[PDB]
Design a protein around this ligand. Structure first.
Ligand SMILES: O=C(O)CN(CC(=O)O)C[C@H](Cc1ccc(NC(=S)NCCO)cc1)N(CC(=O)O)CC(=O)O
Ligand SMILES: [Fe+3]
Lengths: 213, 211
């Protein structure tokens, strides 16, 4: 069986240098053309570089030339990539594919940003609302955190169904996440709904009680 | 060069669907070694076709590659439910690889369905920090494609609006969310705010009148 696992990804400051690695298994690297591809936040696939087998040429994308270098470590059955004048444009999930992108390894996120920060929670309550379905939707805006991940729960478990946690969005070197729940207009405001947000890295725990508007 | 792909297509289990790939430089040929891969949820990637016809080991017979017209094409004969995925194409222009934008393929695994839109006004706590994040959430829509457009007093708000990427709910339906960000000052200058969610020819609008 073939196997490719990439590593090396980490946060990095704009201008910073980074070195990624693709370790292979199930084959001999030497007579195997390897490609480095990237999937951007926008969920677009972009070609980065290709190194031919034998001992041939290495082709670079124009978006990468001069700044990124490729290498093999046939001896350790490894493939490296030197990331060097990291620009914003570069935050992405770096994968390595074998010949004609048959086999692909799991990826490694590199994020070009500013610095670590605990999240600011905002309770999102309906503007002097109604109840179409005798159902009301409340949310929580988990804003400006660094780095990922985050843990968002409602009445710590209790509200499970109705809940819709959405993926983060990065904008000025900080993430923006959102979550919600929809309860019958019987439970809120009669009973309370709290959103339990934790930015585990920062060891931040925050509770917000959603109160009318 | 630029490689072009249809945004999205949809079929029913059992049908035959064709996805195409096109080169802006001229007719795609064998010299471009047309390559086709599939992205499954959680960014899982598997190459299906390579060399403009050859089906990679493992991959089932239902996928075929060829050139028809001045383009590369991937035919999925009797398209199964588990084929709902994203299909990318790559063409080799004797020096590099140009990847296309993918096609989100839907295999109608349950009735067409409409989005549940809800617009949230900015929090007070937040207005104090001089920021105004309006949140628009889109839910339980099927197929997983939507266009969000923002309007402030009629005028489409051309910037500082970020939308997410549809994701799968346990009911294999999808969700998304858009944001608008103004300073607390920009917010004050306007009395009307609209979030518009278009889905299969049908615009859904949710609003709030600030003043
Ligand atoms: O594999 C790639 O990424 C490119 N492929 C096309 C393909 O395999 O789909 C094409 C590649 C053939 C190949 C080799 C080199 C060039 N370019 C040269 S010599 N440029 C000189 C610049 O001064 C083009 C094509 N491979 C042939 C094949 O797969 O049969 C060689 C190989 O795979 O080892
Ligand atoms: Fe090749």
């Amino acid at each position: 069986e073939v196997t490719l696992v990439e590593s090396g990804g980490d946060s990095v400051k704009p201008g910073g240098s980074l070195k990624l690695s693709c370790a292979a298994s199930g084959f001999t690297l030497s007579g195997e053309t390897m490609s480095w591809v990237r999937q951007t936040p926008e969920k677009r696939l972009e070609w980065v570089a290709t190194t031919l087998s034998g001992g041939g040429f290495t082709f670079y994308s124009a978006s990468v030339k001069g700044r990124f270098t490729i290498s093999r470590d046939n001896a350790q059955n490894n493939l490296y990539l030197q990331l060097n004048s990291l620009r914003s444009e570069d935050t992405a999930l770096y994968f390595c594919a074998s010949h004609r992108f048959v086999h692909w390894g799991h990826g490694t996120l590199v994020t070009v940003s500013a610095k670590t920060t605990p999240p600011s929670v905002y309770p999102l309550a309906p503007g002097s609302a109604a109840q179409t379905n005798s159902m009301v939707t409340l949310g929580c805006l988990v804003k400006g955190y660094f780095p990922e991940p985050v843990t968002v729960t409602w009445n710590s478990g209790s509200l499970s169904s109705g809940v819709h946690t959405f993926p983060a969005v990065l904008e000025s070197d900080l993430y923006t996440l959102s979550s919600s729940v929809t309860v019958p207009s019987s439970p809120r405001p009669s009973e309370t709904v709290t959103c339990n947000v934790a930015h585990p890295a920062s060891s931040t725990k925050v509770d917000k009680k959603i109160v009318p508007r | 060069a630029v490689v072009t792909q249809e945004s999205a297509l949809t079929t029913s289990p059992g049908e035959t669907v064709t996805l195409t790939c096109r080169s802006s430089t001229g007719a795609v040929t064998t010299s471009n070694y047309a390559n086709w891969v599939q992205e499954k949820p959680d960014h899982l990637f598997t190459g299906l076709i390579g060399g403009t016809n050859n089906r990679a080991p493992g991959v089932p017979a239902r996928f075929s590659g060829s050139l028809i017209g001045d383009k590369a094409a991937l035919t999925i004969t009797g398209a199964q439910t588990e084929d709902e995925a994203r299909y990318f194409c790559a063409l080799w222009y004797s020096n590099l690889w140009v990847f296309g934008g993918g096609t989100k393929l839907t295999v109608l695994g349950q009735p067409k369905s409409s989005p549940s839109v809800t617009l949230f006004p900015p929090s007070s706590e937040e207005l104090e920090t001089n920021k105004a994040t309006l949140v628009c959430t889109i839910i339980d829509f099927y197929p997983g494609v939507v266009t969000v457009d923002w309007k402030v007093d009629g005028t489409p708000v051309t910037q500082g609006m970020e939308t997410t990427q549809p994701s799968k709910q346990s009911n294999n339906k999808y969700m998304a969310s858009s944001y608008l960000t103004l300073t607390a000052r920009e917010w004050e200058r306007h009395s009307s705010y609209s979030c518009q969610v278009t889905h299969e020819g049908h615009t859904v609008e949710k609003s709030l009148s600030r003043a």
